[PDB]
Symmetry: C3
Subunit: 275 residues, 3 copies
């Protein structure tokens, strides 16, 4: 096996090209760069610039106005820990399809457009993962993809321990190479590409497809920023319990079918550590 992290054109995949290469990538590696998906550094620049201005120069009052009363990183501003501040180590801004907290109309306009482009690209590449593996989710493809996404931008003025994601797919845009993944048993660099987004397959891809997609571990070594988009299923997403057991899930589920809520519990869990 070549341990190269491949690149695919979303448009070419949607035209039915490279299907054998794509299927092999999904099973053996579970990560790839994606071009021709409506996301490049051009779309990132406006959003990145205005949130860094907010991190660096917004006042405490402005920040409090867009901070949730519980520090979950679901929506709005968060100072994130590893005299002073938890913001000394890192700062985050989070959003979803609704219940958002924006510091101004300008920010709102720019970040709503950026979110929509990310959400569209993530549903599109998940649709191709499903098609290439012959997978029809219980309840159908479009209701599975109309889901509960989370976007988080993180600024760092290990940075992240080794883990796998529990998403369907995760899309990463970035600004020494900090991001690393296991490929062919060795740590492999994942540098930025101005022309492409990085796609990690998550454990829900593995689950829905019956084990045809790998969910790879990755870590962040030690300024930098990243945009991380999690495509996450609805709580009522339903799957086969025996099939989950056949591809490595250590479930404690009675009965033949279960939901995402049954498996994970009452709160989303975005990442998991093997150790």
């Amino acid at each position: 096996m070549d341990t190269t992290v491949p690149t695919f054109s979303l448009a070419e995949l949607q035209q039915g090209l490279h299907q054998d290469e794509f299927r092999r990538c999904l099973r053996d590696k579970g990560l790839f760069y994606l071009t021709d998906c409506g996301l490049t550094d051009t779309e990132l620049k406006s959003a990145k610039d205005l949130v860094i201005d907010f991190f660096e120069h917004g006042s405490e009052a402005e920040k409090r106005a867009v901070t949730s009363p519980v520090p979950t990183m679901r929506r709005g501003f968060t100072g994130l820990e590893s005299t002073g501040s938890y913001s000394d180590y890192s700062m985050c801004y989070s959003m979803g399809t609704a219940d958002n907290l924006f510091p101004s109309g300008d920010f709102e306009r720019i970040w709503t457009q950026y979110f929509d482009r990310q959400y569209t690209a993530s549903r599109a590449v998940a649709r191709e993962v499903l098609r290439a593996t012959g997978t029809e989710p219980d309840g159908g493809v479009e209701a599975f993809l109309d889901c509960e996404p989370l976007l988080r931008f993180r600024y760092f003025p290990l940075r992240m321990a080794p883990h796998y994601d529990l998403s369907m797919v995760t899309l990463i845009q970035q600004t020494f190479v900090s991001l690393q993944a296991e490929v062919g048993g060795a740590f492999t660099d994942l540098p930025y590409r101005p022309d492409a987004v990085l796609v990690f397959c998550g454990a829900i891809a593995t689950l829905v497809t019956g084990g045809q997609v790998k969910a790879p571990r990755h870590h962040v070594a030690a300024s930098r920023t990243s945009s991380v988009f999690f495509l996450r299923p609805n709580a009522d997403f339903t799957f086969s319990v025996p099939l989950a057991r056949e591809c490595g899930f250590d479930v404690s589920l009675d009965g033949e079918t279960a939901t995402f809520q049954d498996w994970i519990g009452g709160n989303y869990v975005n990442i998991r550590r093997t150790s």
Copy 2:
């Protein structure tokens, strides 16, 4: 905003005074000192002295007689890890409303009285949090407050990573300032007050009130002792799922209402780390 940690008289709050100051404190800070609540260093001294005597001079046999067969820190004596002993780093004594383990009748009498005073003060200040925010829990106020409290005394012959509490409220009495909380975006000292208890609002205050109360992060830096009282809801405490989502809870709950058990699972979880 002034980043002063305020002090309120429980008696004055119950008389209907300072309601605007109290409401602003709950939303913007989520912590305060509480006087005139039946708890001062006078009530702490007997309980503190006899448990330290037990930690320092009780024998292994005496300690085993009040150690649970599973090391959960729910009831009785625990040596708590960060040749030797896990007790080398810290020692704990835990109790609740029933199923307690006491090393003697003297200890039992002193600690039952101390627990009752803490439980009374915690229900009283939670009642004022609910009243000041116009909150009627599903099932009513008194059945919500007749709940599942946990008292833990900890001796240290970071000491605790940054976290928020998942209680309704937490009451802390203490014996260089080790306890720190985020206030106005900066780490703020929380020293002892012989005349007052420190109150942290927890995530259940945020949840029941629909987001009108902040649950602040805090940490313990590096001998010292502390008494920590968690006022925790019953497993059947029921809330609105859409309202929880509107104030930052990243729930994975199908349907319009849920219970505390639905959210947290089958075991109490007292603290949560953002990271």
Copy 3:
């Protein structure tokens, strides 16, 4: 109390001997060595040798063929983290009663026989724990013991933080003493014995017996290998909620009975840290 870790003959226990010594060991210590159970270094040697050959000399392709697409350590090969590899720190091989991944017919034959001997010994010693404590599980003894075991072999070319196990029982065979447990309040060595297996009682022993069995904390200090066999209950294992509370379990369970799934959730959790 003597803080000696005792040794029992499985055959002698099954003949009804040493019942008072055995009961006292279970309540006060919750660990012991077990002889005369069909497990010695003779049965370990073939299995150990062929998996170390695989770790050291199998190629990446061979390893990928027996790696699950999600890195859960449930089945097959795993590189386990604390340029390079996560395999640099440790390597694991896992199996159960079905859905196994074997690198060859030789390996399969040797490891299926080894698993069967471990599973038999673990059910046998759990049967004696139940008998000695007068315990009839809901649904009966044999359906409780026909369960969901997990075998993991780990090679290390703290190694493990202090924890207790959430199994019924755990059986350990091993190849400076790395493994340590709390006994009588002090860290006590658990060296290998060519003629015996080490048995840890887990929290499910405590639960099913109503608090008559201790689940002791233990840790691994810092090459070495170990074989660790977890005897884990079925998801539908049912117990009394008030009795669980009386022996230290901090449950958040409405109602009078619950299942293992109700308590732990939708995924097995094998170990728990007090801290």
